[PDB]
Scaffold this active site. Structure first.
Site, mmCIF file in Angstrom:
data_model
loop_
_atom_site.group_PDB
_atom_site.id
_atom_site.type_symbol
_atom_site.label_atom_id
_atom_site.label_comp_id
_atom_site.label_asym_id
_atom_site.label_seq_id
_atom_site.Cartn_x
_atom_site.Cartn_y
_atom_site.Cartn_z
ATOM 1 N N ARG A 183 0.948 -0.952 -0.331
ATOM 2 C CA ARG A 183 0.216 0.431 -0.225
ATOM 3 C C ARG A 183 1.039 0.982 0.009
ATOM 4 N NH1 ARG A 183 -3.497 0.133 4.983
ATOM 5 N NH2 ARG A 183 -2.063 2.226 5.499
ATOM 6 N N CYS A 234 -0.748 -22.922 3.529
ATOM 7 C CA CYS A 234 -0.402 -21.477 4.800
ATOM 8 C C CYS A 234 0.790 -22.291 5.185
ATOM 9 C CB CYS A 234 -1.463 -20.962 5.672
ATOM 10 S SG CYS A 234 -1.005 -19.297 6.047
ATOM 11 N N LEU A 235 1.818 -21.880 5.496
ATOM 12 C CA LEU A 235 2.130 -21.991 6.778
ATOM 13 C C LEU A 235 2.482 -21.420 7.912
ATOM 14 C CD1 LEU A 235 5.664 -22.350 5.203
ATOM 15 C CD2 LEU A 235 5.125 -24.514 5.968
ATOM 16 N N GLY A 236 2.078 -20.635 7.827
ATOM 17 C CA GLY A 236 1.210 -19.752 9.572
ATOM 18 C C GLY A 236 -0.188 -19.774 8.983
ATOM 19 N N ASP A 255 -1.264 -8.595 6.400
ATOM 20 C CA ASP A 255 -2.345 -8.204 5.518
ATOM 21 C C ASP A 255 -3.736 -9.041 5.530
ATOM 22 O OD1 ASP A 255 -1.021 -5.752 4.940
ATOM 23 O OD2 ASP A 255 -1.002 -5.806 2.650
ATOM 24 N N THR A 256 -3.223 -10.645 5.418
ATOM 25 C CA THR A 256 -3.644 -11.442 5.053
ATOM 26 C C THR A 256 -4.726 -11.443 7.169
ATOM 27 O OG1 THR A 256 -1.833 -12.604 5.628
ATOM 28 C CG2 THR A 256 -2.814 -13.068 3.616
HETATM 29 C C1 DRB Z 1 3.359 -0.768 -4.789
HETATM 30 C C2 DRB Z 1 2.339 -1.075 -5.906
HETATM 31 C C3 DRB Z 1 2.404 -2.603 -6.446
HETATM 32 C C4 DRB Z 1 1.254 -2.564 -7.514
HETATM 33 C C5 DRB Z 1 0.998 -3.818 -7.225
HETATM 34 C C6 DRB Z 1 1.232 -5.245 -7.028
HETATM 35 C C7 DRB Z 1 0.166 -6.071 -7.581
HETATM 36 C C8 DRB Z 1 1.010 -7.619 -7.200
HETATM 37 C C9 DRB Z 1 2.585 -7.983 -6.581
HETATM 38 C C10 DRB Z 1 3.296 -8.003 -6.279
HETATM 39 C C11 DRB Z 1 3.022 -7.651 -5.003
HETATM 40 C C12 DRB Z 1 3.735 -8.340 -3.795
HETATM 41 C C13 DRB Z 1 3.486 -8.798 -2.467
HETATM 42 C C14 DRB Z 1 4.604 -8.957 -1.242
HETATM 43 C C15 DRB Z 1 4.138 -9.594 0.013
HETATM 44 C C16 DRB Z 1 3.351 -11.135 -0.222
HETATM 45 O O1 DRB Z 1 4.122 -11.417 -0.555
HETATM 46 N N1 DRB Z 1 2.403 -12.088 0.650
HETATM 47 C C17 DRB Z 1 2.312 -13.787 0.334
HETATM 48 C C18 DRB Z 1 1.799 -14.171 1.350
HETATM 49 C C19 DRB Z 1 0.049 -13.437 1.894
HETATM 50 C C20 DRB Z 1 -1.031 -13.839 0.312
HETATM 51 C C21 DRB Z 1 -0.734 -15.693 0.213
HETATM 52 C C22 DRB Z 1 0.588 -15.414 -0.014
HETATM 53 C C23 DRB Z 1 1.775 -15.390 1.259
HETATM 54 C C24 DRB Z 1 1.783 -14.868 -0.763
HETATM 55 C C25 DRB Z 1 1.891 -13.505 -0.744
HETATM 56 C C26 DRB Z 1 0.027 -12.709 -1.062
HETATM 57 C C27 DRB Z 1 0.118 -6.105 -8.450
HETATM 58 C C28 DRB Z 1 -0.495 -5.188 -9.405
HETATM 59 N N2 DRB Z 1 0.244 -4.015 -8.623
HETATM 60 RU RU1 DRB Z 1 -0.017 -2.192 -10.004
HETATM 61 N N3 DRB Z 1 1.523 -2.064 -10.456
HETATM 62 C C29 DRB Z 1 2.656 -3.300 -10.793
HETATM 63 C C30 DRB Z 1 4.273 -3.050 -11.751
HETATM 64 C C31 DRB Z 1 3.717 -1.552 -12.649
HETATM 65 C C32 DRB Z 1 2.992 -0.970 -12.053
HETATM 66 C C33 DRB Z 1 2.025 -0.990 -11.930
HETATM 67 C C34 DRB Z 1 0.916 -0.128 -11.400
HETATM 68 C C35 DRB Z 1 0.594 1.186 -12.545
HETATM 69 C C36 DRB Z 1 -0.116 2.436 -11.930
HETATM 70 C C37 DRB Z 1 -1.196 1.966 -11.270
HETATM 71 C C38 DRB Z 1 -1.211 0.458 -10.296
HETATM 72 N N4 DRB Z 1 0.271 0.594 -10.456
HETATM 73 N N5 DRB Z 1 -2.208 -2.476 -9.024
HETATM 74 C C39 DRB Z 1 -2.317 -1.809 -7.322
HETATM 75 C C40 DRB Z 1 -3.830 -1.536 -7.038
HETATM 76 C C41 DRB Z 1 -4.381 -1.834 -7.560
HETATM 77 C C42 DRB Z 1 -4.262 -2.665 -9.469
HETATM 78 C C43 DRB Z 1 -2.973 -2.554 -9.672
HETATM 79 C C44 DRB Z 1 -3.021 -2.792 -11.183
HETATM 80 C C45 DRB Z 1 -3.637 -3.446 -11.703
HETATM 81 C C46 DRB Z 1 -2.577 -3.468 -13.199
HETATM 82 C C47 DRB Z 1 -1.197 -3.781 -13.263
HETATM 83 C C48 DRB Z 1 -1.044 -3.068 -12.511
HETATM 84 N N6 DRB Z 1 -0.936 -2.434 -11.343
HETATM 85 N N7 DRB Z 1 0.769 -1.310 -7.817
HETATM 86 C C49 DRB Z 1 1.384 -0.137 -7.972
HETATM 87 C C50 DRB Z 1 2.275 -0.080 -6.423
HETATM 88 C C1 HEM Z 2 -5.635 -15.404 8.036
HETATM 89 C C2 HEM Z 2 -4.195 -15.511 7.615
HETATM 90 C C3 HEM Z 2 -4.378 -16.003 6.280
HETATM 91 C C4 HEM Z 2 -3.915 -16.185 5.340
HETATM 92 C C5 HEM Z 2 -5.802 -16.168 4.570
HETATM 93 C C6 HEM Z 2 -3.452 -17.330 4.196
HETATM 94 C C7 HEM Z 2 -3.561 -17.244 2.923
HETATM 95 C C8 HEM Z 2 -2.073 -18.192 2.433
HETATM 96 C C9 HEM Z 2 -2.008 -18.462 1.279
HETATM 97 C C10 HEM Z 2 -3.732 -19.083 0.067
HETATM 98 C C11 HEM Z 2 -1.193 -18.908 0.973
HETATM 99 C C12 HEM Z 2 -0.734 -19.713 -0.323
HETATM 100 C C13 HEM Z 2 -0.693 -18.859 -1.257
HETATM 101 C C14 HEM Z 2 -0.137 -19.765 -2.683
HETATM 102 O O1 HEM Z 2 -0.992 -20.878 -2.896
HETATM 103 O O2 HEM Z 2 0.479 -19.020 -3.599
HETATM 104 C C15 HEM Z 2 -0.398 -19.108 2.165
HETATM 105 C C16 HEM Z 2 1.241 -18.766 2.492
HETATM 106 C C17 HEM Z 2 2.286 -18.777 2.872
HETATM 107 N N1 HEM Z 2 1.556 -17.822 3.726
HETATM 108 FE FE1 HEM Z 2 -0.409 -17.447 5.097
HETATM 109 N N2 HEM Z 2 -2.218 -16.772 5.340
HETATM 110 C C18 HEM Z 2 -2.369 -16.661 6.300
HETATM 111 C C19 HEM Z 2 -1.229 -16.162 7.564
HETATM 112 C C20 HEM Z 2 -0.796 -16.188 7.547
HETATM 113 C C21 HEM Z 2 0.242 -16.609 9.065
HETATM 114 C C22 HEM Z 2 -0.268 -15.947 9.899
HETATM 115 C C23 HEM Z 2 1.837 -16.766 8.147
HETATM 116 C C24 HEM Z 2 2.215 -15.860 8.786
HETATM 117 C C25 HEM Z 2 4.278 -16.208 8.767
HETATM 118 C C26 HEM Z 2 1.934 -16.826 6.782
HETATM 119 C C27 HEM Z 2 2.864 -17.535 6.568
HETATM 120 C C28 HEM Z 2 2.639 -17.775 4.728
HETATM 121 C C29 HEM Z 2 3.316 -18.671 3.749
HETATM 122 C C30 HEM Z 2 5.084 -18.421 4.850
HETATM 123 C C31 HEM Z 2 3.497 -19.025 3.151
HETATM 124 C C32 HEM Z 2 4.045 -19.542 1.942
HETATM 125 C C33 HEM Z 2 4.163 -21.427 1.499
HETATM 126 C C34 HEM Z 2 5.262 -21.524 0.845
HETATM 127 O O3 HEM Z 2 5.002 -21.218 -0.436
HETATM 128 O O4 HEM Z 2 5.016 -22.868 0.807
HETATM 129 N N3 HEM Z 2 0.278 -16.870 6.797
HETATM 130 N N4 HEM Z 2 -0.599 -17.988 2.979
#
Ligand code: DRB
Ligand code: HEM
EC number: 1.14.15.1
Length: 406
Positions: free
Chosen positions: A178, A349-351, A243-244
């Site tokens: 964000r 999900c590991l968490g 965020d989740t």
């Molecule tokens: C700062 C930031 C991020 C961002 C993303 C991120 C992702 C996501 C990929 C990277 C994010 C990584 C997350 C890292 C954290 C994480 O890994 N959490 C884990 C955790 C919890 C769940 C489950 C699993 C465990 C896996 C994962 C998610 C995808 C798209 N964009 Ru979008 N974007 C992306 C690249 C280049 C440009 C771009 C723009 C440009 C203008 C307007 C919007 N966007 N953007 C933003 C808001 C709404 C729409 C939108 C679009 C729409 C179309 C095209 C581009 N963009 N954007 C912008 C800023």
């Molecule tokens: C309500 C809460 C949560 C939801 C709904 C959620 C959901 C998910 C989902 C859907 C994935 C798999 C994504 C994929 O297949 O690509 C994932 C992966 C993962 N989550 Fe969560 N999650 C939650 C909380 C947490 C918490 C508390 C942790 C703590 C650290 C965590 C750690 C991870 C990690 C490390 C992975 C990666 C697993 C792998 O790639 O092998 N998550 N989660």
């Protein structure tokens, strides 16, 4: 409109232009907005021209099947569009087995059930402190006042990090999902690494019992884990549970604020809280990531091309009327609550265990002290859609006279 030209291999009859970042009728609720993909006139597998163009599996059967089949559906590019899933480096989200298995086992040592059971009451102590600080006020923005501080403080506990580092760490993680413009994703990511690396190196030499110490001293393929692998693992352990949890707790509390009878059910029947947690996880599921095709593959009568991206909404499996009857209805007494809220397959999900404990503890401790609460008068709750859908803000109110300090 921002529609990418339809690839030649995709049949026109499968086109449904759903925008995962701004779906129509978001005002009706985000889960309801995504549920449009499950209406009778929409195929099980569709292609949207939004966000660069990609497939979308709309039913639980297909979502589960694709997540199980990592050979065809790779995690190398999990995000839409492609020029975001290719950049990202966190481990082991972008890895496919066997590579993923080594790192996954190590991560389980820091967040697995044994660890969660051991930290169970520490999580409770944190929840109680936050709730007691808000109780006398008779109001709060749940998302900002509890949902955000809770998970990050739990991470500090888990990773053995000082409380004083929270505001900055929170800012860095906030910029990754964000951004306000001060930092690019790469800069925020590197800032996180600049913070983690010194701690990882120090704990490799003088380890403790915390998460960072365990990861830093881990072994991968017969040799010690590298600094690069360790920081990328710790980075995911941090962001994965933020965020989740923040958004999920918000969806759950929004529902409870609007549902007096459901609040009473849990007050009268405390033993139903774990079941309630599972039902809420199903109804308010919120993650939607994807995979990329490793080769040309025919899936359920549809020709998929190598390199095609496919969104497999974890959110949708539990809302599928073919899986759960009256999917939009919250029923804590359901005999079989089916969902893939925490994912499915090798990346489950590991968490998940930590998350469930956080949810159950929050529900019990909140209802214990503030049994009666409602949405603030005049407030209209807004949702947001994306990889992790959520709640913008949750203004809640209550009469302090109906609360109790415990
Ligand atoms: C700062 C930031 C991020 C961002 C993303 C991120 C992702 C996501 C990929 C990277 C994010 C990584 C997350 C890292 C954290 C994480 O890994 N959490 C884990 C955790 C919890 C769940 C489950 C699993 C465990 C896996 C994962 C998610 C995808 C798209 N964009 Ru979008 N974007 C992306 C690249 C280049 C440009 C771009 C723009 C440009 C203008 C307007 C919007 N966007 N953007 C933003 C808001 C709404 C729409 C939108 C679009 C729409 C179309 C095209 C581009 N963009 N954007 C912008 C800023
Ligand atoms: C309500 C809460 C949560 C939801 C709904 C959620 C959901 C998910 C989902 C859907 C994935 C798999 C994504 C994929 O297949 O690509 C994932 C992966 C993962 N989550 Fe969560 N999650 C939650 C909380 C947490 C918490 C508390 C942790 C703590 C650290 C965590 C750690 C991870 C990690 C490390 C992975 C990666 C697993 C792998 O790639 O092998 N998550 N989660």
């Amino acid at each position: 409109a921002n529609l990418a030209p339809l690839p030649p291999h995709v049949p026109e009859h499968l086109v449904f232009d759903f925008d995962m970042y701004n779906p129509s009728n978001l005002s009706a609720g985000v889960q309801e907005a995504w549920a449009v993909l499950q209406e009778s006139n929409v195929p099980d597998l569709v292609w949207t021209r939004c966000n660069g163009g990609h497939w979308i599996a709309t039913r639980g059967q297909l979502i589960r099947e694709a997540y199980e089949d990592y050979r065809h559906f790779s995690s190398e590019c999990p995000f839409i569009p492609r020029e975001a899933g290719e950049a990202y480096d966190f481990i082991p989200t972008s890895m496919d087995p066997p590579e993923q298995r080594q790192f996954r086992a190590l991560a389980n040592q820091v967040v697995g059930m044994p660890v969660v059971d051991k930290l169970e009451n520490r999580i409770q102590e944190l929840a109680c402190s936050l709730i007691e600080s808000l109780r006398p006020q008779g109001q709060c923005n749940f998302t900002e006042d509890y949902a955000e501080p809770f998970p990050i403080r739990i991470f500090m506990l888990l990773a053995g990090l000082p409380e004083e580092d929270i505001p900055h760490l929170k800012y860095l993680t906030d910029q990754m999902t964000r951004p306000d413009g001060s930092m690019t994703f790469a800069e925020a990511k590197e800032a996180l690494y600049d913070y983690l690396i010194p701690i990882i190196e120090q704990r490799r030499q003088k380890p403790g019992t915390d998460a960072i110490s365990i990861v830093a001293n881990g072994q991968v393929n017969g040799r010690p884990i590298t600094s690069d692998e360790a920081k990328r693992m710790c980075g995911l352990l941090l962001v994965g549970g933020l965020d989740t949890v923040v958004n999920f707790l918000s969806f759950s509390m929004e529902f409870l604020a609007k549902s007096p009878e459901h609040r009473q059910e849990l007050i009268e029947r405390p033993e139903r809280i774990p079941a309630a947690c599972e039902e809420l996880l199903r109804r308010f599921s919120l993650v939607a990531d994807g995979r990329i095709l490793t080769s040309d593959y025919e899936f359920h009568g549809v020709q998929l091309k190598k390199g095609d991206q496919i969104l497999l909404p974890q959110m949708l499996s539990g809302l599928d009327e073919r899986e759960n009857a009256a999917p939009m209805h919250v029923d804590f007494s359901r005999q079989k609550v089916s969902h893939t809220t925490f994912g499915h397959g090798s990346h489950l999900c590991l968490g998940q265990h930590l998350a469930r404990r956080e949810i159950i503890v929050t529900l019990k401790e909140w209802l214990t002290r503030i049994p009666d609460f409602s949405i603030a008068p005049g407030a209209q709750i807004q949702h947001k859609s994306g990889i992790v859908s959520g709640v913008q803000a949750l203004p809640l109110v209550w009469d302090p006279a109906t609360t109790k300090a415990v």
